[PDB]
Design a protein around this ligand. Structure first.
Ligand SMILES: [Zn+2]
Length: 101
């Protein structure tokens, strides 16, 4: 429950990635991108860790299920079904190490 989804924000993410979104923007709106993401590098709303990296006609969802450490927004039908499946495929989903001293 934050107000980063009002004021203009909604259309502040509805912009684009190259110069228009030739992906599936109706699915993006469910994945937390395009209007439903945040700014340019569609960060998402509830997500603590959303980004974009669009590979080869990939879904917004596998992208937005491989870097999110949490997306309470999307933890609903995706986070109990998606990831339950996606994590089946991703045994390196969880946090590894980085600069942990
Ligand atoms: Zn998210």
């Amino acid at each position: 429950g934050s107000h980063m989804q009002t004021h203009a924000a909604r259309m502040r993410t509805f912009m684009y990635w190259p110069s228009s979104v030739p992906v599936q923007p109706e699915q993006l709106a469910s994945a937390g991108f395009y209007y439903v993401g945040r700014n340019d590098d569609v960060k998402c709303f509830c997500c603590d860790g959303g980004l974009r990296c669009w590979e080869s006609g990939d879904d917004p969802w596998v992208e937005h299920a491989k870097w999110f450490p949490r997306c309470e927004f999307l933890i609903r039908m995706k986070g109990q079904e998606f990831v339950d499946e996606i994590q089946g495929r991703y045994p390196h989903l969880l946090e590894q190490l980085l600069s942990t001293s």
